[PDB]
Amino acid sequence: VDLGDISGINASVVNIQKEIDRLNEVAKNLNESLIDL
Amino acid sequence: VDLGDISGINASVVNIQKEIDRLNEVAKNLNESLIDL
Amino acid sequence: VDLGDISGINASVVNIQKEIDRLNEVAKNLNESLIDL
Amino acid sequence: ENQKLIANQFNSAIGKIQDSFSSTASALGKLQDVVNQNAQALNTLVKQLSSNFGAISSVLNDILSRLDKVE
Amino acid sequence: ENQKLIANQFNSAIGKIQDSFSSTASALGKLQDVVNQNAQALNTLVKQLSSNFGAISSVLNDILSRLDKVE
Amino acid sequence: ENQKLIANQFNSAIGKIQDSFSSTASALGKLQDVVNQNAQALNTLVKQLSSNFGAISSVLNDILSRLDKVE
């Protein structure tokens, strides 16, 4: 009895921490773009 | 014969409905920011 | 011996390529909204 | 004249930003729905797998005991 | 002078918004790819699991019948 | 007067855009955490499933060989 091998099934991981950091950085830096007449 | 217990394996759920609601609210409220000279 | 059937378990797929294309299109088109006094 | 230009560019930009935020909201909603469906699928698979290994176990213990009786 | 200030602030804000939308698009694309790969992985696991439980079943029925023959 | 209107509308829009980008960042972070947890869960399930099929196999081969000895 030889059961099918399933060890090859792999689930990838996502790494969007750069993009989240950029989004928070922009949400903070947009205060430097407010108009103060 | 004692097979390994796997009942502890749990898959979390995400709840970003607050953020989606905020995004749609902003997409609607940005009409209150248009300039009408 | 009749083991439980699990073939009905299905994992959906997401199709947000329209939204990603729209986001990149807007990130490109916002150059047509810069002010050149 | 320059004020009309600024206002028109700002209105165009705000319209594009509204469209983009609606797109981001729709994309996040679809991703939430799909991730939650996949989580429910994995949880149901874990439950059915636990049940099936329980059944396979019980059957194997029946076999082992009844074969110990045999020999 | 105030018009130049408004134009410069607006151009800076539009540049930052462009960068942020490119970032959001890249993040949504990566999340889509990863969620779809995980969905394909779970589906392939479900298929292989169904096949393996089919095989384990058939083997157990062989055992049970041939042991009924034994006893 | 029109400049004050443009500045006020622009500041309101930039505040709303800041809130929306913070929301998008929080949503992407939550989605990343959940997708990564589900990936780790599927990987751990695959490992435990491989171990359990290994054990079930070895047991079935024991049964088959010892029943070949029987008959």
Numbering used by the authors:
A (entry chain D), B (entry chain F), C (entry chain E): 1164 to 1200
D (entry chain C), E (entry chain B), F (entry chain A): 918 to 988
Reproduce the article's own wording on this structure.
In each case, the process of viral membrane fusion is mediated by the trimeric viral spike glycoprotein (S) that is cleaved into S1 and S2 subunits by multiple host proteases upon infection. Two heptad repeat regions, HR1 and HR2, distant from each other in the prefusion S, drive membrane fusion by assembly into a six-helix bundle. This HR1HR2 bundle formation is thought to provide the energy for membrane fusion and is therefore a target for therapeutics, as exemplified by peptide inhibitors that disrupt infection by the HIV-1 (19, 20), SARS-CoV, MERS-CoV, SARS-CoV-2 (23–25), human parainfluenza virus 3 (26), and respiratory syncytial virus. We therefore designed a scaffold to efficiently determine structures of the postfusion HR1HR2 bundle and its mutants to near-atomic resolution by single-particle cryo-EM.
We determined single-particle cryo-EM structures of the five selected single mutants and the Omicron triple mutant of HR1HR2 using the same molecular scaffold (NpDps4) and data processing workflow as for the EM structure of the wild-type HR1HR2 bundle. The L938F mutation fills a hole in the HR1 bundle, but it decreases the fusion activity to 67% of wild type. However, the observed decreases in fusion activities for the L938F mutation cannot be as easily explained by the observed structure—the mutant phenylalanine side chain is well determined in the map and it does not produce an apparent change of the surrounding atoms. It is possible, or even likely, that the mutations affect the membrane fusion mechanism in a way that is not related to the postfusion state; for example, this mutation as well as the others could affect the stability of the prefusion spike, or the transition from the prefusion state to the extended intermediate state of the S2 (14). The fusion activities of the D936Y, L938F, and V1176F mutations are ∼60% of that of wild type, while the fusion activity of the S940F mutant is ∼25% of that of wild type. Overall, none of the five single and the Omicron triple mutations dramatically altered the architecture of the HR1HR2 bundle, as indicated by the small RMSDs between the wild-type and the mutant structures.
